[model samples]
Target: DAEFRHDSGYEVHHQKLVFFAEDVGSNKGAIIGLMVGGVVIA
Candidate 1:
């Protein structure tokens, strides 16, 4: 397996997204929300 990363220097991107969550009161749901937000990937 291999991994590669793409970079865009000195740029800020904004996207409008909505998360459909069942249970947001727990840690797992919060993590999922973060993942959906793309910050985890960022």
Candidate 2:
């Protein structure tokens, strides 16, 4: 429900793309490595 999304307070602004890229790049690389070795991240 919409309530769930707002419970933490609304986001004040869109996150910067560079920050998004940096975050995903750091975290997803670990997932990719796990997948490469046949590990399930989820």
Candidate 3:
């Protein structure tokens, strides 16, 4: 299901969530706290 992976694929559409909700395994927070090297949003 969508509990162990990108729900289907590891694409941008799948990674659109968790903008800052504390994920697991990969942990996509804090590190991107100041991620301004790209078109970061606010």
Poorly placed runs, candidate 3 (over 4 Å): 1-32
In candidate 1, what are the lDDT values of residues 1-42, reduced to their tens digit?
Answer: 444555878986676666676857754423332232233432
Q: Against the unseen true structure, what C-alpha lDDT does each candidate score? A: 0.49, 0.36, 0.41
Clashes found in each candidate (C-alpha, N, C closer than 3 A): 0, 0, 0
lDDT string, candidate 2, 1-42, tens digits: 123223555556544334245435345333221122234453
By descending TM-score, how would the candidates be arranged?
Answer: 1, 2, 3
lDDT of 3 by residue, 1-42 (tens): 223333556554333334544555664324333233446333
Q: Against the hidden reference, what TM-scores do the models get?
A: 0.24, 0.16, 0.14
- Residue 35 in candidate 2, Cα distance off native in Å: 20
In model 2, which range of ten residues has the least summed lDDT? 29-38
Best by lDDT: 1
